[PDB]
Amino acid sequence: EILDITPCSFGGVSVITPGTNTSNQVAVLYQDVNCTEV
């Protein structure tokens, strides 16, 4: 049977954080990928 192969690890990861003296809250951005794991 014909089977396709697609490499894993879609896109990258980016970190959004304010100034160190403002707050420690952060937001995670996953580049060029839909929300799957979350």
Binding site: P7, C8, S9, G12, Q31
Partner: protein, 48 residues
């Protein structure tokens, strides 16, 4: 005006899901880090 923003993962490109290859690449120092920083700077300059 603006060039397409391309971010190349030298860790994945050089080594695909390999640990020994990852260690061998790390043995070369920050070349992968330097390339990643250069590409990020290119993207930032294009945005600017």
């Amino acid at each position: 005006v603006s060039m397409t923003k391309t971010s190349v993962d030298c860790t994945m490109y050089i080594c695909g899901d390999s640990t020994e290859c990852s260690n061998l690449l790390l043995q070369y120092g920050s070349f992968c880090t330097q390339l990643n920083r250069a590409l990020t700077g290119i993207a930032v300059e294009q945005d600017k």
